[PDB]
A paper describes a structure:
Feruloyl esterases (FAEs, E.C. 3.1.1.73), a subfamily of carboxylic acid esterases, are mainly associated with the release and exploitation of HCAs from plant cell walls. In this study, we aimed to obtain and characterize a feruloyl esterase (LaFae) from Lactobacillus acidophilus. Seven α-helices surround the β-sheets and form a core domain that contains an active site with conserved catalytic triad residues (Ser106, Asp197 and His225).
The crystal of unliganded LaFae belongs to the space group of P212121 with two molecules in the asymmetric unit. The β1 and β2 strands form an antiparallel β-sheet while the β3–β8 strands form parallel β-sheets. Several hydrogen bonds (Asp9-Leu11, Asp94-Lys86 and Leu118-Arg171) and salt bridges (Arg8-Asp9, Asp74-Lys86, Asp121-Arg171 and Asp121-His153) were observed at the dimerization interface; however, hydrophobic interactions (Ile81, Ala82, Leu118, Phe168, Val175, Leu176, Pro177 and Ile181) were predominant during the dimerization of LaFae.
Author numbering:
A (entry chain A): 2 to 144, 147 to 245
B (entry chain B): 0 to 142, 165 to 245
């Protein structure tokens, strides 16, 4: 069912899904850039988790979906703050037992960074085509292009203006630095035909994590479109089966 | 003239004091306080006036969870205070009355200023750091919200800060018992264009006569 939480005066909208029972593990499900908390990928994860007794939360990040905040005011850092506030509401739920994180694309960056900040609280992590390229995209100019040494107050996209503060913080994000601090198990799932995030980024998480595995879905794209969604849902509920 | 201005940041209202010299065009300094303080301590209130009298305008805001500004102190982090200062920077950036933008930060607001300049080294033209609390990172690593402490342990203070290569002045009191003087020296060393000014016998808050010496050194660096 439907829940809301506040972070710095903005409201975040999410959906909560529960299995039969008073106590259960709980996964926090994080989407990617310009996406929402109702992509097919995340809902099928929420349904399949529920069938193996894993509750789950999935929220619209600030500036996305039904949550508050202009798109051009989002950064990966206030998204990390969004996730800290979902983590805390989950952490105070008397029905939650263990806490898992599940992020796709830019949400996988968020998940891995919250995990390195909370390595003692988060017991398993699933990164789904995590988008660490965004730091290298910000440093280069193309994410079309711009000038990475004089970045404007916003760069036009599809109507949703991308804030210049996202880019400047994207360039200096300590993505792998913070994530290596998490030594509990990590499953990384990537598609063999992902044209959005090159292989190196996932292969780099696998080599930096101390307790990780890197699955590859043949022929799968960045989004895990259609049939590819099943192989990514299967792997993710595999990893999280209690 | 002096003004009260408000500002929004993710739906939280931040509360500031704008002080200007009489004219249509001038430089301006953003002045940021430290943890537990507010925009209107004697030291920041003094730097504002001395600057007003050098044709250097100034705004000073209460950080989120501080003074009059919105938000709880437990929800404060060094990252959301950067995001406060960024919103103020955008504000200042968008005044046709502003020529050059300087940053000034005491204690924790000095870490914030060093990090906002490291992100905006094309826009920020001059920085003055008074007793920068870069030690908060090492305090958090050895042993106020839990989120403040978890991010403080992994803050890349010097590594962002160093991308700023315009002139920066670092003024510490020599008898600081809050932040080791060792943190003002790593700043002056990693900065490609900086200067160290130690005020003998001054404490971390630069009180009494030491406030006057701190605002002299501050104002004479930002002086045009």
């Amino acid at each position: 069912s439907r829940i809301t939480i506040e972070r710095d005066g903005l409201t975040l909208v999410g959906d909560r899904e529960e299995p039969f029972g008073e106590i259960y593990d709980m996964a926090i499900l994080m989407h990617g850039f310009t996406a929402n908390r109702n992509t097919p990928l995340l809902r099928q994860i929420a349904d399949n988790l529920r069938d193996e007794n894993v509750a789950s939360v999935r929220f619209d990040f600030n500036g996305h979906g039904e949550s508050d905040g202009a798109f051009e005011d989002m950064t990966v850092c206030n998204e990390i703050a969004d996730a800290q506030k979902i983590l805390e509401y989950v952490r105070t739920d008397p029905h939650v037992r263990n806490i898992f994180l599940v992020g796709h694309s830019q949400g996988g960056v968020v998940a891995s960074m919250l995990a390195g900040l909370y390595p003692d609280i988060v017991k398993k992590v699933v990164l789904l085509a995590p988008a660490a390229q965004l730091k290298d995209d910000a440093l280069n100019g193309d994410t079309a292009t711009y000038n990475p040494e004089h970045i404007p107050a916003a760069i036009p996209f599809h109507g949703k203006k991308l804030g210049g503060f996202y880019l400047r913080t994207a360039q200096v994000l300590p993505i792998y630095e913070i994530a290596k601090h998490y030594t509990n198990p990590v499953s990384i799932i990537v598609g063999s035909n992902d044209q959005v995030v090159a292989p190196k980024y996932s292969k780099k998480y696998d080599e930096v994590y101390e307790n990780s595995e890197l699955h590859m879905v043949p022929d799968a794209d960045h989004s895990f479109t259609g049939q590819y969604k099943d192989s990514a849902v299967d792997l993710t509920a595999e990893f999280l089966k209690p």
